[PDB]
Curated annotation (Swiss-Prot), chain A:
Traits of the deletion mutant: Small plants with white leaves that do not contain chlorophyll. Mutant plants are unable to grow autotrophically on soil and flowers are sterile.
Keyword Repeat: no
UniProt subunit comment: Homodimer and heterodimer with MORF9. Interacts with protoporphyrinogen oxidase 1 PPOX1. Heterodimers with MORF8/RIP1 and MORF9/RIP9. Interacts with PCMP-A2/PMD1. Interacts with ORRM1. Interacts with ORRM6.
A GO MF label: protein homodimerization activity
Function: Involved in plastid rRNA processing and consequently in translation and early chloroplast differentiation. Involved in organellar RNA editing. Required for the processing of multiple editing sites in plastids.
Alphabetical GO biological process terms: cytidine to uridine editing; endonucleolytic cleavage of tetracistronic rRNA transcript (SSU-rRNA, LSU-rRNA, 4.5S-rRNA, 5S-rRNA); mitochondrial mRNA modification; mRNA processing; plastid organization
Lineage: Eukaryota, Viridiplantae, Streptophyta, Embryophyta, Tracheophyta
Main location: plastid
Family: Belongs to the MORF family.
Keyword Chloroplast (UniProt): yes
Protein name per Swiss-Prot or TrEMBL: Multiple organellar RNA editing factor 2, chloroplastic
GO cellular component, one term: mitochondrion
Protein source organism: Arabidopsis thaliana (Mouse-ear cress)
Subcellular location: Plastid, Chloroplast
Keywords (A to Z) from UniProt: Chloroplast, mRNA processing, Plastid, Transit peptide
Length: 116, 114
């Protein structure tokens, strides 16, 4: 599958962070969770390329396969699976684009390419 | 991981049976979805070993790797991952036990192990 290089991982979580959490609170939880295996929150922001707060709750990050297995044990983590492109022409793994800790909006044309 | 033999697959789905679907509508969706790659609904009931209607929406089934890749394409399917035991001593993949199209309750002690 294109984009599936086992260097990009989709991490699905149960209730980050807690019941009735805001988008902002889930994203902090995503960052804090990944931080526990990459050393710090700033390194975590560097590695996360997208975040999901609907359809499924989770995030995509650039980590090696060894690091991804260290995520499996962590509280709150449901699944850790190898990610692949939703839109190969733009190397887009889908969900909401997340770059350096910021949500980035796609152009309207690209958002249609990522539509299910 | 124990029980992870790539013959047991956890299929996670996006709102099975629609918004605010009942358990049965979710379960009906699991069966009908798996039926499209396994040949029939009666066969689908044979292959599903558990169902999940909370925490995540999906089901566990015994299928080969070739079949699981055919599930990825189907409408409604989010993730298809190789399943593994939650309670290895009882070869239990977790969630809600599903036998012959019916949800089966575990003994109270076994519930705690899961």
């Amino acid at each position: 599958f294109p984009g599936c290089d086992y260097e990009h991982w989709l991490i699905v979580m149960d209730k980050p962070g807690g019941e009735g959490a805001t988008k902002q609170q889930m994203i902090d939880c995503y960052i804090q969770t990944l931080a526990k295996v990459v050393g710090s929150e700033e390194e975590a922001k560097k590695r996360i390329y997208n975040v999901s707060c609907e359809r499924y709750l989770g995030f995509g990050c650039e980590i090696d396969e060894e690091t991804s297995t260290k995520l499996e044990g962590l509280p709150g983590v449901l699944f850790v699976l190898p990610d692949s492109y939703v839109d190969p022409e733009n190397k887009d793994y889908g969900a909401e684009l997340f770059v350096n800790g910021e949500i980035v909006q796609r152009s309207p044309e690209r958002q249609r390419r990522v539509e299910p």
